[PDB]
Amino acid sequence: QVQLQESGPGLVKPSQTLSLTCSFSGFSLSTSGMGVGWIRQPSGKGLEWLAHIWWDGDESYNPSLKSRLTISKDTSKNQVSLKITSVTAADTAVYFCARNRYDPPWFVDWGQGTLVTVSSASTKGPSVFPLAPSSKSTSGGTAALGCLVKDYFPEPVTVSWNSGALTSGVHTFPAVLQSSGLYSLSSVVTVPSSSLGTQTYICNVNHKPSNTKVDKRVEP
Amino acid sequence: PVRSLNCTLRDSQQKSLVMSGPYELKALHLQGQDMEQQVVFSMSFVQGEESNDKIPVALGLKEKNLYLSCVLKDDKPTLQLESVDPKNYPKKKMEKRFVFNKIEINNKLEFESAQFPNWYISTSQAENMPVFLGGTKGGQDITDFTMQFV
Amino acid sequence: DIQMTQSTSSLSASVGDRVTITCRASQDISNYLSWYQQKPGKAVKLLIYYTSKLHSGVPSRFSGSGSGTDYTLTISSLQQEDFATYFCLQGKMLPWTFGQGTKLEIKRTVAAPSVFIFPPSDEQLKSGTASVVCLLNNFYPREAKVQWKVDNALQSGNSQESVTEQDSKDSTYSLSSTLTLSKADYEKHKVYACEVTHQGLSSPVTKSFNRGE
């Protein structure tokens, strides 16, 4: 029925202008009472309301950053844009768009969000290493295997197993920022020791910001 | 400061509007001795679509920190009287629910809710009934008013 | 600005418990309050609007109450899928403001981790670095002491931990600990061990390997 989807540049330098787009379907923003808002969430923090636009183009802004914000709509493309000028590291966050009908607003549908990192650091692809299952794990029991996705920037990195056909027992850990300023994470999966063995295990790694793609076979 | 004016409103059938409760208005004919009971509105000119036939306004009760608003209640556009922060009102950019499109039609006034088009500030033909938001095309209820400056 | 506050930042509760999450506005918000649920890897969901109205599709165990400045979100009988962060929002006055959020964790029976150790790959060793990985799989509670020992010497400041968000089906956590050494430092030692102290273990579990294959 209704869907909202945020898109944006992923990594921006401090003092640059950030342009975000909310692509929506299943409703018209020209319908009386209709509205679209932008909300952000910095890492480890809560939700912050940023801006809103009504069907009649009446714009609303959070005064804590009103001078730096511009919200606009394109009812021919079914898109709502958010422009943030002179960005700083304080603007690093997941940005969401959400819709409502009428004031006061009840934000009924939200997008999945888009991550924006504000940094002068260079984009770097990860190295992908296998975490081979142990030869002395469990005799006819459970074995663990994985992939180490090391030294990349910015977030995020996409990790799947057997091109998405393997989901049970998978844990892709949250990335950890290293002292070098590069991220690292491991993705693991627990499997029966009996099929180590007979079944092929491939970790599919895609660091979309650097276009670094690696499929690694994880063998005993 | 936002442009505003002090006025009274009377419906098409000359019924006056009074404060019947802390968040309620009623319409009834007032005899010469009870005229002072009528509410005095402070009508402000807010942001929106400018036209000599349709202009955006906010309807506040003079020095009472109360504004008329229209909100969806159980899927029905509903007229309300809401208390506001005295330190933030009146303001040029009002929250959407407070905005009415003031329409000048046949030497009378109509107040259409900005977010609920085709819904108007209305009165019942009967006496001492609450002032409400009406969506009827043209029948039983009154949507036409006269304005008297205070 | 109307300030919204949620006195509880985080809490844990058992399945079946009646859970109460409070929100206080700095001034009268005339019941113009809504509650949102945020789950890991999922879009935020509206649960309750206009203080007490349930959004279509939301389970009936969720309810809302309050007036003026004090509001409450209630979960009548808590379920394992209810692990999330809950935020209130006021729509009384611009700028619209949210509460800081209340993160609700699910309490469950203690479950010991399955422990696994991974030496650095031959592939990584060719690059000059050695990462040793310790995996703690599907355990509860989140709290665990994970220590690295190299030739019986306790390691300090050369490892990093990562923990998964609470599992939606079994309410457990999983943890990784990565010890990073230079290839040269790694080749100077034989015994690499990961030692785990946890409420589910009767005595600490150690997983180890000898570099000499």
Nearest chain C Cα to A143, which residue?
A: C116
3-state secondary structure chain B: CCCEEEEEEEECCCCEEEEEECCEEEEECCCCCCHHHECCEEEEECCCCCCCCEEEEEEEECCCCEEEEEEEECCEEEEEEEECCCCCCCCCCCCHHHEEEEEEECCEEEEEECCCCCCEEEECCCCCEECEEECCCCCCCECCEEEEEC
Resolution in A: 1.8
Q: Which CATH number fits domain A121-219: 3.40.50.1000, 3.30.565.10, 3.40.50.1820, 2.60.40.10?
A: 2.60.40.10
**What's chain A's length in residues?**
220
Residue B91 identity (one-letter amino acid): K
Residue C125 has φ and ψ, to the nearest 5°, of -55, -30
Count of C-beta atoms within a 10 Å radius of residue B150: 11
- A139 contacts A106 by C-beta, under 8 angstroms: no
Phi-psi region of C138 (alpha: psi -120 to 50; beta: other; left: phi over 0): left
Q: How far apart are CA C57 and CA B135, in angstroms?
A: 30
Cβ–Cβ under 8 Å, residues C162 and C144: no
Which three-class secondary structure state does DSSP give residue C123? helix
Does any CB of chain A come closer than 8 Å to the CB of residue B93?
A: yes
- Strand arrangement of the beta sheet that strand C191-197 belongs to: C153-154, C145-150, C191-197, C205-210
CB C143 within 8 A of CB C199: yes
- Tokens 């409070």 -> residue: C22
Q: Please report, for residues A155, B23, B48, B90, the alpha-carbon distance to residue B110 in angstroms, rounded to integers and kept in the order given.
A: 56, 22, 17, 22
Q: How far apart are CA A168 and CA A189, in angstroms?
A: 8
d(CA A60, CA A35): 11
Dihedral (C-alpha) C72, A2, C85, C56: value to the nearest 10 degrees?
Answer: 30
Cα–Cα distance, C30 to B116 (Å, whole number) = 20
Q: How far apart are CA A210 and CA A152, in angstroms?
A: 9
End-to-end CA distance of chain B: 19
Contact B10, B148 (CB under 8 A): yes
Cis amide linkage into residue C141, ω under 30° from 0: yes
Residue with tokens 């511009």: A70
- Match 């990961």 to its residue by tokens: C194
The position carrying tokens 């330190």 is: B87
How many other C-beta atoms are found inside a 10 Å radius of the C-beta of residue C47?
23
Dihedral over alpha carbons C144, C149, C154, C158 (to 10 degrees): -80
Closest CA to C146 of C116, C106, C181, C119: C116
Residue identified by tokens 């789950």 is C39
Q: Is B80 on the interface with A (CB under 8 A)?
A: no
Which residue has tokens 């693991």?
Answer: A188
C109-211 matches C1-108 in CATH topology: yes
Kindly determine whether residue A103 and residue B117, on different chains, have CB atoms separated by under 8 Å.
no
Query: A73-104: string of b/e by CB count within 10 Å (b at 16+)?
Result: beeeebbbbbebeebeeebbbbbbbbbbbbbb
Q: Which residues 109-128 in chain B show a CB within 8 A of chain A?
A: 114-117
Residues of chain C found within 8 Å of residue A155, distances taken between Cβ atoms:
none
Question: How is chain C split among helix, strand and coil, in percent rounded to 5?
Answer: 5, 50, 45
Contact C190, C211 (CB under 8 A): yes
Q: Which domain holds residue B127?
A: 1-150
Pick one of 3.30.70.141, 2.60.40.650, 1.10.10.10, 2.60.40.10 as the CATH number of A1-120. 2.60.40.10
Could you tell me the two tokens for C70?
Answer: 């004090």
The residue whose two tokens read 């493309």 is A77
Residue C146 CB contacts under 8 Å (≥ 6 apart), including other chains: C134, C136, C161, C175, C177, C194, C195, C196
Paired strand residues for A121: none
Q: Kindly list the domain boundaries of chain A, sorted by start residue.
A: 1-120, 121-219
Q: Distance (Å, rounded) from C-alpha A149 to C-alpha B113?
A: 57
Two tokens at C39? 């789950």
The angle subtended at Cα C89 by Cα C83 and Cα C91, nearest 5°, is: 155
Report domain C1-108's class: mainly beta
Looking at the DSSP bridge assignments, the partners of residue B112 are: B101, B120
CA distance B30 to C30: 32
Q: In this complex, is the C-beta atom of B82 within 8 Å of any C-beta atom belonging to chain C?
A: yes
User: Quick one: which of A153, A83, A156 has its CA closest to A119?
Assistant: A153
The total of structural domains in chain B comes to 1
Please tell me if residue B47 touches chain C, with a CB cutoff of 8 Å.
no
Coil, helix or strand for A208? helix
B contact chains, 3+ CB pairs < 8 A: A, C
CATH code of the domain covering residue B117: 2.80.10.50
In order of A71, A146, A188, the CA distances from A133 in angstroms are 51, 8, 10
Cβ contacts (< 8 Å) between C50 and chain B: which residues? 73
Of C205, C4, C201, C45, nearest to C110 (Cα)?
Answer: C201
Q: Are strands C102-107 and C10-14 parallel, antiparallel or unpaired?
A: parallel
Q: Are C7 and A79 in contact (CB under 8 A)?
A: no
In angstroms, the separation between the Cα of residue B68 and the nearest Cα of chain C is 14
Measured in whole angstroms, the distance separating CA B1 from the mean position of its chain's CA atoms is 21
* Inter-chain residue contact B95 with C30, CB threshold 8 Å: no
Q: Which residues, at least 6 apart from C92, have a Cβ–Cβ distance to it below 8 Å?
A: A104, C2, C25, C27, C28, C29, C30, C32
Please give the DSSP secondary-structure letter assigned to residue C183. Answer: H
B80 contacts in A (CB within 8 Å)? none
Is the CA virtual torsion A88, A90, A96, A97 positive or negative? negative
CA distances A44 to A93, A187, A208, A217, C101, Å, are: 10, 22, 23, 34, 11
Domain assignments of chain C as residue spans, ordered by start = 1-108, 109-211
Tokens 């000359």 found at: B14
Look at the alpha carbons of B109, B113, B116, B121 in this order and tell me if their dihedral is positive or negative. Answer: negative
Between β-strands C33-38 and B41-45, what pairing exists: parallel, antiparallel or unpaired? unpaired
State how far the Cα of A189 lies from the Cα of C4, in Å rounded to an integer.
42
Which residues of chain B does A32 touch, with a Cβ-Cβ cutoff of 8 Å? 115-117
**Calpha distance C160→A178 (Å, rounded):** 8
Enter the tokens of residue B32: 């010469």
Would you call the peptide bond into A154 cis, given omega within 30 degrees of 0 as the criterion?
A: yes
Q: Which residues of A touch C169 (CB under 8 A)?
A: none
Superfamily for C109-211? Answer: Immunoglobulins (2.60.40.10)
Pair of tokens at residue C208: 């180890």
Q: According to the entry, how was the structure determined?
A: X-ray
